[PDB]
Design a protein around this ligand. Sequence first.
Ligand SMILES: Nc1ncnc2c1ncn2[C@@H]1O[C@H](COP(=O)(O)OP(=O)(O)NP(=O)(O)O)[C@@H](O)[C@H]1O
Lengths: 8, 488
Amino acid sequence: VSTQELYS
Amino acid sequence: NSHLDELNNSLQHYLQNLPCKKFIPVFYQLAARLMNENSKFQQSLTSICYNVGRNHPYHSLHVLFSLVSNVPEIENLDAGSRYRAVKKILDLLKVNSNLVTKLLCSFENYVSLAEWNPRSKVDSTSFSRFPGYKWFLKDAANYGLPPITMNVKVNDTGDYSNIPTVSSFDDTIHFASGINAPKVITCLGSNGHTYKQLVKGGNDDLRQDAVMEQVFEQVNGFLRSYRKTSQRNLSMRTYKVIPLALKTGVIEWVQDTIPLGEYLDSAHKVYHPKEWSLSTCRKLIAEKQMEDLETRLKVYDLVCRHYRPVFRHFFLESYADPVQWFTTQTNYARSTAVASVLGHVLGLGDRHGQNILIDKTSGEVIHIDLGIAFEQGKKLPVPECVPFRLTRDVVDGMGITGVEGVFRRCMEFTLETLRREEDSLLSVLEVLRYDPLFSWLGESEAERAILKVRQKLSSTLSVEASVGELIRIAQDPSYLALMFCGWS
Ligand SMILES: Nc1ncnc2c1ncn2[C@@H]1O[C@H](COP(=O)(O)OP(=O)(O)NP(=O)(O)O)[C@@H](O)[C@H]1O
């Protein structure tokens, strides 16, 4: 896994 | 307008005669609208909810539980009032009885299953697992019910006993665990077909995914009621979503598929072993994060020169003799073009290979985990440039022809069909706006988002010019370099 965590 | 009862009178004298079938497409929002306070509008909404929950348990009960599943009391929100109202509607639908409580028990069992997760990895024939799984091996033996993930056809009368109910569930859980918790559970079927249910314990925005899938289904309807947008048989493919809870929902693990991200990592090694691995690319770009524009473009050009495209080989040597291969290739081109145009229109977020599933024997693409929407990414702590997913491997997979031909034609037909039925679309997006369920990552980014939607569909620029500029902006290496690590 490596995609951006899309976190707030 | 939900203030004066006089308006509501002349409409409650009509909607009570409306068939329940008409109220299902918007029942997510409508379900979000009910409340426990007593008003004539509230009375009409309660009647609508009872009508759909009694006549068609299947298409409404999962939403009903989704809005009643987890709702705290101390914190004050319209979610709590809608929970009280939806619980009252559930009790009303259960008084009249066996099927309602059967579906409630099925949802509770599915959410409890999704709650827990062990650590393992399995594939191929045969497997056994699961603690406390007696309920899943005798479902129809106890409660004759369908597994929650078939597209049950809507019937005008409403009550049918011909729906297939499945009791035998395979003991295998080929669970593969990504971020957070994923469990896969495959059950048999009354007709004799197995359905795979992907339950997620991680806080994936499954409710946003569900409303997005509703928008996708209505878009399939729009493409259906037209000449050009249906001779192609184009359709933004939808995978059924049944979110019992936002954090612990369950979706339909689509029939046999290999996700794009999990694919072409083995194909990259097998087809091009000499070229660099993803490790060299990844954190090399990692070194690129703090560099300037020219350095970023230079290192990206180097790594993209190293790693030649490889996804073009999936459609070869896998499906069949050429006619099936070409039908699959055009299916992939059309589905990915429609999905990309729609995601650009609605500002869909993450578009990595881990969120893309290629069918196989058909080729239609299925975008998964569309939690970020309405232009949510780009504006990430780490910024992006591309509007929709278009790498070099993806355009390699569209065929020898790049994105100029069937892809661009499908995209432009999609654009013109979406513009022609704009008014209905922005109506749908408006009813999304006024409910507090869709994520738009008082005044909200949703308003500017739909304004940008209208601008993207604005007729000021010719549709052909718009598709050309979209293809250029999503194919140019200068934009692609800044996107993120990988994305070759
Ligand atoms: N409809 C589907 N078809 C195929 N695979 C699916 C489907 N739904 C979910 N999956 C799988 O479930 C996982 C989805 O990713 P997920 O578990 O949400 O981790 P994630 O972190 O959110 N994605 P990412 O951050 O890009 O790695 C992948 O392993 C997919 O293969």
